[PDB]
Amino acid sequence: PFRDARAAPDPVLEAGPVAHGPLPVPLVLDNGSFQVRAGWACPGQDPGPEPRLQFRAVCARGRGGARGASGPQMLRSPFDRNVPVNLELQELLLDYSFQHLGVSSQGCVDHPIVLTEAVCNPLYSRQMMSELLFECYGIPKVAYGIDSLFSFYHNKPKNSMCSGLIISSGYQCTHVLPILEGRLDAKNCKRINLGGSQAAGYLQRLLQLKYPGHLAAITLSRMEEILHEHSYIAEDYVEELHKWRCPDYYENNVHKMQLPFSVFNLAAYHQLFVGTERIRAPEIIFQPSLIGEEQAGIAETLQYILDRYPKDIQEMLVQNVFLTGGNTMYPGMKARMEKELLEMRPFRSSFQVQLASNPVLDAWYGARDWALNHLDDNEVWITRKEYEEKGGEYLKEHCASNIYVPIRLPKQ
Amino acid sequence: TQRIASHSHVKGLGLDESGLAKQAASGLVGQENAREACGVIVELIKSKKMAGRAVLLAGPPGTGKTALALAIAQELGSKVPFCPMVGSEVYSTEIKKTEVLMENFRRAIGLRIKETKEVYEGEVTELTPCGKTISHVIIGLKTAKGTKQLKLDPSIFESLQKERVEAGDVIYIEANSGAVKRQGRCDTYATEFDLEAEEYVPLPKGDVHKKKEIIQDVTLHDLDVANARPQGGQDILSMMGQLMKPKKTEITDKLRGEINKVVNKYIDQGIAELVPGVLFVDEVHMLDIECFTYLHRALESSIAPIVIFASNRGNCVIRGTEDITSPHGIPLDLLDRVMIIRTMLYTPQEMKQIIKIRAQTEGINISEEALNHLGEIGTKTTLRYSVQLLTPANLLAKINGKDSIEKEHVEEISELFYDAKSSAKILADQQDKY
């Protein structure tokens, strides 16, 4: 059967668990369209003791304005396509995180932060975000970096310059990030405009049209369970679905995902038999024409971005294919990726496919390790006063952050 | 599985390391004096130095002459040409008698030619021609084991273009032969139309690039024939080749002179090595006096193979002499050119061993009480009749629901199928009704 999801934990804190040593201790903030997660950087502690505040990045407020259910409690989200594009909800989303993390005393957030952002971020979105973050929250210095390259930075052997493909896959996008001696090669980097949200929406739509007898009993928040728990990506899809064609293998693998009970009852309380549906939804990021989209998908994009390099520099980045983000939770994801890669590498040539030590939380642990290592750097952070002489589109180009384009934004 | 045959049990001469015969070995029994003589002939053929030297296996019907000639073939194995012919094969209607001898003498001398068989196969990812016309063609190949690019010559590209190849076809290229085969469109394109008149093959589950050191076998007669007449020249892909049917033809001794002078030019380079072989002119008594008299050149010539003759005829007339009797049916002038090996009638115990070797080869379980009867019926008749009863007797035993021969099965078969000498008595009695 399904479970049901948690709500309303009590992660309340003091003015803040501010660590010893130098005065600043930064917040580590990860923003993505599935979940926000945030914690103090906890310097001098080798394992992060708690990536605090795991909660769904979706919020509600009363029709008289009287209360705001920002935490895990219909609802709305401040992102579009895994970039933040909001003010009036983005503030109450930040407020919830700071209020649970602890606020020191005065009319600003106390101490510096690393805030995770989209691969490329539209200049206006970083401007709107830095404007919120300096006008309302007043942070003394700020770092912007990428969830994917942070999770890579954690999974590195060392504080060393590296080359690789980051195969990222968040809630509403999956991106192939080629990197060259720590620099994200944003000139020829690519993304597929699909992810876990669209695979879960597809898995909902499949079971809606399979079971019109109870369109209300299935729901997106239950599809998120069977998509994480019981779905798997094929070793190769046209062969997996061929072994699903025979009733003996089908009956051995079709899942009794029962609805909660009050004819054999199943007309109202079905076992919701999922068979090829526990494959189809995972395959969306490899074959997005399953949801009708004409995008090249994660296998042909990896070929298309890779073959644009000189042959002698394709090797030392296929030497670190790095799988990361929420969809890489699927069992078999490494085993699929190394086949899709063997089918396109030169005949004898080596490749290496690494999976993030945690498929998703390593974005935050990466931003933590990054902030801990870069805490006392000057040139690496946007310092508060720089926002009076740079327009808020500005970026510092540290490792695990995007290219900066010398530019300005007109506004009134 | 394989089919059992009249000789499928003989696997060698069965001689020991001294060159003397074992009583029963490598599927043969008895016959020691002739087997020891064949031991010397196997050493002669393995020694390569000799040309045209020849042997006659002489002796009664059903005494092992063809079994020993095939034992020589098995001692040498596939690595040295053994060419079997009946003397009756000489009567062609497209070429003269004394040509068919020379063709078969040239089949018994081999060339052994090593080459590194070098196969590429996979989905063609691209074809891109590169002089201003075509210097070379880059081709890309993919399989579920990886990818390669090849730099094809323009003649291989003409072959891709004759095979009607396009990007996404699954191709087999052989880099030695320049052979090209389209195998189908790669099935990743099987949705390109909902019906198209093509076969879609899955992307190969194998290497883009495969190597063997293959070791080719070819004979001077393959060279003589493939160089004498103008070749068919085109891979079908033509219709001039509809008009002129082939025939066998009297290949001139002047061409064979050049084929010899060319093969010397290649074996000096070590590109090929020679394997002097055996021609087995089985039942040589069926050659005509003109064929026999041509052997008085062919056995002298410094190129010729070793030749093994066989005969079972008495003091009979030489075929085509209309009058002249001579031993083994062979002219005395040729019989003075061959080393004769005698062949003998067996004792009953030596037949009984052959009956068991036949049974345990032919797949028959046989009880001793029936094997003693086939040993006796061999003495009443001939060795080949006894051996021929085994499968019929087993096949009645199988129909009678039994796992083995017993006396009643062979006894019933004896009274059901006659031998060549009991049947001759029926024809001598009923003489006026046949």
Ligand SMILES: Nc1ncnc2c1ncn2[C@@H]1O[C@H](COP(=O)(O)OP(=O)(O)OP(=O)(O)O)[C@@H](O)[C@H]1O
């Ligand atoms: N060790 C053996 N010794 C002699 N003959 C054997 C032996 N092994 C097999 N044979 C027998 O050889 C017989 C057939 O070939 P064989 O040489 O006797 O024919 P042939 O009459 O003598 O000569 P030809 O082939 O010219 O007719 C078979 O019955 C086979 O069982």
